[PDB]
PDB file of all heavy atoms in Angstrom:
ATOM      1  N   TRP K   2     103.572 115.564 103.205  1.00 29.36           N
ATOM      2  CA  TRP K   2     102.214 115.024 103.186  1.00 29.36           C
ATOM      3  C   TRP K   2     102.090 113.862 104.165  1.00 29.36           C
ATOM      4  O   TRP K   2     103.036 113.202 104.495  1.00 29.36           O
ATOM      5  CB  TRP K   2     101.833 114.538 101.762  1.00 29.36           C
ATOM      6  CG  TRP K   2     102.588 113.364 101.318  1.00 29.36           C
ATOM      7  CD1 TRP K   2     103.815 113.350 100.643  1.00 29.36           C
ATOM      8  CD2 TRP K   2     102.221 111.970 101.469  1.00 29.36           C
ATOM      9  NE1 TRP K   2     104.185 112.053 100.358  1.00 29.36           N
ATOM     10  CE2 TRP K   2     103.234 111.224 100.856  1.00 29.36           C
ATOM     11  CE3 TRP K   2     101.119 111.335 102.020  1.00 29.36           C
ATOM     12  CZ2 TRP K   2     103.169 109.819 100.808  1.00 29.36           C
ATOM     13  CZ3 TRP K   2     101.051 109.952 101.979  1.00 29.36           C
ATOM     14  CH2 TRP K   2     102.067 109.204 101.360  1.00 29.36           C
ATOM     15  N   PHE K  17     100.455 118.489  94.923  1.00 35.96           N
ATOM     16  CA  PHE K  17     100.221 117.521  93.855  1.00 35.96           C
ATOM     17  C   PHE K  17      98.874 117.877  93.217  1.00 35.96           C
ATOM     18  O   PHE K  17      97.849 117.206  93.533  1.00 35.96           O
ATOM     19  CB  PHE K  17     100.259 116.094  94.373  1.00 35.96           C
ATOM     20  CG  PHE K  17     101.509 115.783  95.105  1.00 35.96           C
ATOM     21  CD1 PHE K  17     101.572 115.942  96.471  1.00 35.96           C
ATOM     22  CD2 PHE K  17     102.683 115.453  94.395  1.00 35.96           C
ATOM     23  CE1 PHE K  17     102.765 115.741  97.150  1.00 35.96           C
ATOM     24  CE2 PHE K  17     103.857 115.235  95.093  1.00 35.96           C
ATOM     25  CZ  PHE K  17     103.895 115.384  96.445  1.00 35.96           C
ATOM     26  N   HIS K  61     104.444 105.976 105.678  1.00 33.83           N
ATOM     27  CA  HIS K  61     103.046 105.974 105.288  1.00 33.83           C
ATOM     28  C   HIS K  61     102.383 104.613 105.202  1.00 33.83           C
ATOM     29  O   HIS K  61     101.171 104.495 105.267  1.00 33.83           O
ATOM     30  CB  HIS K  61     102.800 106.800 103.950  1.00 33.83           C
ATOM     31  CG  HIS K  61     103.715 106.460 102.806  1.00 33.83           C
ATOM     32  ND1 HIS K  61     103.391 105.549 101.794  1.00 33.83           N
ATOM     33  CD2 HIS K  61     104.959 106.911 102.491  1.00 33.83           C
ATOM     34  CE1 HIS K  61     104.376 105.489 100.923  1.00 33.83           C
ATOM     35  NE2 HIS K  61     105.336 106.294 101.329  1.00 33.83           N
ATOM     36  N   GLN K  64     106.011  98.159 103.405  1.00 31.42           N
ATOM     37  CA  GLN K  64     106.097  97.686 102.067  1.00 31.42           C
ATOM     38  C   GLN K  64     107.007  96.467 102.063  1.00 31.42           C
ATOM     39  O   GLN K  64     108.092  96.509 102.661  1.00 31.42           O
ATOM     40  CB  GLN K  64     106.850  98.673 101.217  1.00 31.42           C
ATOM     41  CG  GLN K  64     106.330  98.793  99.809  1.00 31.42           C
ATOM     42  CD  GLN K  64     107.202  99.738  98.952  1.00 31.42           C
ATOM     43  OE1 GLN K  64     108.417  99.686  99.021  1.00 31.42           O
ATOM     44  NE2 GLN K  64     106.545 100.725  98.327  1.00 31.42           N
ATOM     45  N   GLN K  89     106.302  95.511  94.557  1.00  9.89           N
ATOM     46  CA  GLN K  89     106.083  95.645  96.022  1.00  9.89           C
ATOM     47  C   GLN K  89     104.644  95.438  96.329  1.00  9.89           C
ATOM     48  O   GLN K  89     103.785  95.632  95.488  1.00  9.89           O
ATOM     49  CB  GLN K  89     106.506  97.029  96.560  1.00  9.89           C
ATOM     50  CG  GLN K  89     105.920  98.213  95.750  1.00  9.89           C
ATOM     51  CD  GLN K  89     104.854  98.948  96.532  1.00  9.89           C
ATOM     52  OE1 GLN K  89     104.207  98.402  97.464  1.00  9.89           O
ATOM     53  NE2 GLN K  89     104.715 100.217  96.240  1.00  9.89           N
ATOM     54  N   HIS K  91     101.968  96.560  99.795  1.00  9.46           N
ATOM     55  CA  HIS K  91     101.789  97.327 101.015  1.00  9.46           C
ATOM     56  C   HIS K  91     100.335  97.292 101.388  1.00  9.46           C
ATOM     57  O   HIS K  91      99.520  96.812 100.586  1.00  9.46           O
ATOM     58  CB  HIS K  91     102.317  98.757 100.824  1.00  9.46           C
ATOM     59  CG  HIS K  91     101.529  99.493  99.803  1.00  9.46           C
ATOM     60  ND1 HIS K  91     101.864  99.500  98.461  1.00  9.46           N
ATOM     61  CD2 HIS K  91     100.387 100.191  99.902  1.00  9.46           C
ATOM     62  CE1 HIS K  91     100.966 100.213  97.804  1.00  9.46           C
ATOM     63  NE2 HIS K  91     100.064 100.638  98.657  1.00  9.46           N
ATOM     64  N   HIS K  93      96.840  99.488 103.429  1.00 11.39           N
ATOM     65  CA  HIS K  93      96.222 100.650 104.042  1.00 11.39           C
ATOM     66  C   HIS K  93      95.251 100.090 105.060  1.00 11.39           C
ATOM     67  O   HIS K  93      94.586  99.080 104.777  1.00 11.39           O
ATOM     68  CB  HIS K  93      95.450 101.485 102.971  1.00 11.39           C
ATOM     69  CG  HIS K  93      96.344 101.896 101.846  1.00 11.39           C
ATOM     70  ND1 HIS K  93      97.001 103.101 101.810  1.00 11.39           N
ATOM     71  CD2 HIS K  93      96.676 101.275 100.699  1.00 11.39           C
ATOM     72  CE1 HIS K  93      97.696 103.211 100.681  1.00 11.39           C
ATOM     73  NE2 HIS K  93      97.565 102.074 100.008  1.00 11.39           N
ATOM     74  N   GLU K 103      90.661 101.723 100.987  1.00 16.79           N
ATOM     75  CA  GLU K 103      90.653 102.864 100.112  1.00 16.79           C
ATOM     76  C   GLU K 103      89.466 102.800  99.136  1.00 16.79           C
ATOM     77  O   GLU K 103      88.597 103.675  99.166  1.00 16.79           O
ATOM     78  CB  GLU K 103      92.014 102.963  99.375  1.00 16.79           C
ATOM     79  CG  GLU K 103      93.067 103.296 100.400  1.00 16.79           C
ATOM     80  CD  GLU K 103      94.334 103.870  99.831  1.00 16.79           C
ATOM     81  OE1 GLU K 103      94.853 103.390  98.800  1.00 16.79           O
ATOM     82  OE2 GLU K 103      94.691 104.952 100.378  1.00 16.79           O
ATOM     83  N   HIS K 116      97.610  96.225  98.448  1.00 11.54           N
ATOM     84  CA  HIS K 116      97.923  96.658  97.080  1.00 11.54           C
ATOM     85  C   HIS K 116      99.182  95.953  96.677  1.00 11.54           C
ATOM     86  O   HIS K 116     100.268  96.164  97.224  1.00 11.54           O
ATOM     87  CB  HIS K 116      98.171  98.173  97.063  1.00 11.54           C
ATOM     88  CG  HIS K 116      96.895  98.951  97.224  1.00 11.54           C
ATOM     89  ND1 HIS K 116      96.851 100.305  97.604  1.00 11.54           N
ATOM     90  CD2 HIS K 116      95.629  98.541  97.069  1.00 11.54           C
ATOM     91  CE1 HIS K 116      95.588 100.655  97.653  1.00 11.54           C
ATOM     92  NE2 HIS K 116      94.802  99.606  97.317  1.00 11.54           N
ATOM     93  N   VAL K 118     101.617  95.876  93.668  1.00 14.25           N
ATOM     94  CA  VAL K 118     101.963  96.941  92.700  1.00 14.25           C
ATOM     95  C   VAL K 118     102.839  96.342  91.624  1.00 14.25           C
ATOM     96  O   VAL K 118     103.909  95.793  91.906  1.00 14.25           O
ATOM     97  CB  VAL K 118     102.688  98.082  93.396  1.00 14.25           C
ATOM     98  CG1 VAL K 118     103.046  99.186  92.429  1.00 14.25           C
ATOM     99  CG2 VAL K 118     101.844  98.618  94.555  1.00 14.25           C
ATOM    100  N   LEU K 137     101.167 101.159  85.278  1.00  3.74           N
ATOM    101  CA  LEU K 137     101.103 100.316  86.463  1.00  3.74           C
ATOM    102  C   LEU K 137      99.798  99.539  86.460  1.00  3.74           C
ATOM    103  O   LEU K 137      98.783  99.969  85.896  1.00  3.74           O
ATOM    104  CB  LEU K 137     101.231 101.116  87.743  1.00  3.74           C
ATOM    105  CG  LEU K 137     102.632 101.361  88.304  1.00  3.74           C
ATOM    106  CD1 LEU K 137     103.535 102.107  87.379  1.00  3.74           C
ATOM    107  CD2 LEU K 137     102.499 102.091  89.665  1.00  3.74           C
ATOM    108  N   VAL K 139      97.712  97.779  89.691  1.00  6.90           N
ATOM    109  CA  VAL K 139      97.657  97.506  91.130  1.00  6.90           C
ATOM    110  C   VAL K 139      96.495  96.546  91.344  1.00  6.90           C
ATOM    111  O   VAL K 139      95.370  96.820  90.917  1.00  6.90           O
ATOM    112  CB  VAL K 139      97.581  98.757  91.992  1.00  6.90           C
ATOM    113  CG1 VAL K 139      97.648  98.316  93.443  1.00  6.90           C
ATOM    114  CG2 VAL K 139      98.724  99.670  91.658  1.00  6.90           C
ATOM    115  N   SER K 193      94.621 106.022  89.514  1.00  2.00           N
ATOM    116  CA  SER K 193      95.882 106.719  89.906  1.00  2.00           C
ATOM    117  C   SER K 193      96.510 106.044  91.081  1.00  2.00           C
ATOM    118  O   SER K 193      95.922 105.182  91.736  1.00  2.00           O
ATOM    119  CB  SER K 193      95.577 108.193  90.344  1.00  2.00           C
ATOM    120  OG  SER K 193      94.941 108.250  91.615  1.00  2.00           O
ATOM    121  N   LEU K 194      97.745 106.431  91.408  1.00  2.00           N
ATOM    122  CA  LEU K 194      98.284 106.150  92.712  1.00  2.00           C
ATOM    123  C   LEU K 194      97.396 106.806  93.779  1.00  2.00           C
ATOM    124  O   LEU K 194      96.902 107.914  93.560  1.00  2.00           O
ATOM    125  CB  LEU K 194      99.709 106.716  92.814  1.00  2.00           C
ATOM    126  CG  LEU K 194     100.686 106.303  91.725  1.00  2.00           C
ATOM    127  CD1 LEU K 194     102.032 107.023  92.005  1.00  2.00           C
ATOM    128  CD2 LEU K 194     100.895 104.834  91.567  1.00  2.00           C
ATOM    129  N   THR K 195      97.241 106.172  94.909  1.00  2.00           N
ATOM    130  CA  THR K 195      96.445 106.722  95.974  1.00  2.00           C
ATOM    131  C   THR K 195      97.245 107.478  97.015  1.00  2.00           C
ATOM    132  O   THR K 195      96.667 108.013  97.969  1.00  2.00           O
ATOM    133  CB  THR K 195      95.655 105.633  96.717  1.00  2.00           C
ATOM    134  OG1 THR K 195      96.560 104.819  97.453  1.00  2.00           O
ATOM    135  CG2 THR K 195      94.841 104.762  95.747  1.00  2.00           C
ATOM    136  N   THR K 196      98.561 107.559  96.841  1.00  2.00           N
ATOM    137  CA  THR K 196      99.419 108.443  97.627  1.00  2.00           C
ATOM    138  C   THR K 196     100.198 109.341  96.668  1.00  2.00           C
ATOM    139  O   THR K 196     100.351 108.998  95.481  1.00  2.00           O
ATOM    140  CB  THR K 196     100.412 107.635  98.453  1.00  2.00           C
ATOM    141  OG1 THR K 196     101.145 106.713  97.651  1.00  2.00           O
ATOM    142  CG2 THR K 196      99.719 106.865  99.548  1.00  2.00           C
ATOM    143  N   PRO K 197     100.615 110.501  97.134  1.00  2.00           N
ATOM    144  CA  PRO K 197     101.546 111.338  96.291  1.00  2.00           C
ATOM    145  C   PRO K 197     102.622 110.429  95.691  1.00  2.00           C
ATOM    146  O   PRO K 197     103.194 109.543  96.382  1.00  2.00           O
ATOM    147  CB  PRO K 197     102.082 112.313  97.292  1.00  2.00           C
ATOM    148  CG  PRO K 197     100.960 112.537  98.272  1.00  2.00           C
ATOM    149  CD  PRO K 197     100.360 111.124  98.429  1.00  2.00           C
ATOM    150  N   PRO K 198     102.943 110.655  94.397  1.00  2.00           N
ATOM    151  CA  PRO K 198     102.532 111.797  93.582  1.00  2.00           C
ATOM    152  C   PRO K 198     101.128 111.693  92.913  1.00  2.00           C
ATOM    153  O   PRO K 198     100.864 112.562  92.077  1.00  2.00           O
ATOM    154  CB  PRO K 198     103.609 111.882  92.525  1.00  2.00           C
ATOM    155  CG  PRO K 198     104.017 110.465  92.315  1.00  2.00           C
ATOM    156  CD  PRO K 198     103.975 109.861  93.717  1.00  2.00           C
ATOM    157  N   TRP K 205      93.541  99.816  87.661  1.00  2.00           N
ATOM    158  CA  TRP K 205      93.151  99.179  88.956  1.00  2.00           C
ATOM    159  C   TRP K 205      92.421  97.880  88.673  1.00  2.00           C
ATOM    160  O   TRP K 205      91.553  97.800  87.828  1.00  2.00           O
ATOM    161  CB  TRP K 205      92.282 100.111  89.777  1.00  2.00           C
ATOM    162  CG  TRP K 205      93.126 101.041  90.582  1.00  2.00           C
ATOM    163  CD1 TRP K 205      93.504 102.341  90.241  1.00  2.00           C
ATOM    164  CD2 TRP K 205      93.785 100.710  91.798  1.00  2.00           C
ATOM    165  NE1 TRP K 205      94.361 102.824  91.198  1.00  2.00           N
ATOM    166  CE2 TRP K 205      94.517 101.843  92.189  1.00  2.00           C
ATOM    167  CE3 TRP K 205      93.787  99.571  92.609  1.00  2.00           C
ATOM    168  CZ2 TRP K 205      95.300 101.866  93.328  1.00  2.00           C
ATOM    169  CZ3 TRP K 205      94.532  99.632  93.780  1.00  2.00           C
ATOM    170  CH2 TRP K 205      95.311 100.744  94.147  1.00  2.00           C
TER     171      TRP K 205
HETATM  172  N1  LIG J   1      98.741 103.094  97.049  1.00  2.00           N
HETATM  173  S1  LIG J   1      99.046 102.667  95.474  1.00  2.00           S
HETATM  174  O1  LIG J   1      98.115 103.456  94.540  1.00  2.00           O
HETATM  175  O2  LIG J   1      99.063 101.115  95.306  1.00  2.00           O
HETATM  176  C1  LIG J   1     100.705 103.136  95.051  1.00  2.00           C
HETATM  177  C2  LIG J   1     101.477 102.284  94.232  1.00  2.00           C
HETATM  178  C3  LIG J   1     102.723 102.670  93.860  1.00  2.00           C
HETATM  179  C4  LIG J   1     103.257 103.875  94.294  1.00  2.00           C
HETATM  180  O3  LIG J   1     104.521 104.226  93.916  1.00  2.00           O
HETATM  181  C5  LIG J   1     102.492 104.715  95.109  1.00  2.00           C
HETATM  182  N2  LIG J   1     102.974 105.963  95.600  1.00  2.00           N
HETATM  183  C6  LIG J   1     104.198 105.957  96.394  1.00  2.00           C
HETATM  184  O4  LIG J   1     104.757 104.953  96.646  1.00  2.00           O
HETATM  185  N3  LIG J   1     104.620 107.233  96.846  1.00  2.00           N
HETATM  186  C7  LIG J   1     105.839 107.339  97.666  1.00  2.00           C
HETATM  187  C8  LIG J   1     106.047 108.734  98.250  1.00  2.00           C
HETATM  188  C9  LIG J   1     106.301 109.851  97.213  1.00  2.00           C
HETATM  189  C10 LIG J   1     107.022 109.542  96.055  1.00  2.00           C
HETATM  190  C11 LIG J   1     107.273 110.534  95.112  1.00  2.00           C
HETATM  191  C12 LIG J   1     106.730 111.815  95.380  1.00  2.00           C
HETATM  192  C13 LIG J   1     106.033 112.019  96.557  1.00  2.00           C
HETATM  193  N4  LIG J   1     105.825 111.066  97.411  1.00  2.00           N
HETATM  194  C14 LIG J   1     101.216 104.361  95.481  1.00  2.00           C
END
Side-chain angles (χ1 to χ4, degrees):
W2 67 272
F17 306 93
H61 51 95
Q64 218 185 41
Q89 47 111 337
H91 61 272
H93 303 269
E103 294 200 314
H116 290 161
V118 179
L137 270 61
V139 184
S193 73
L194 307 180
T195 68
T196 53
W205 276 96

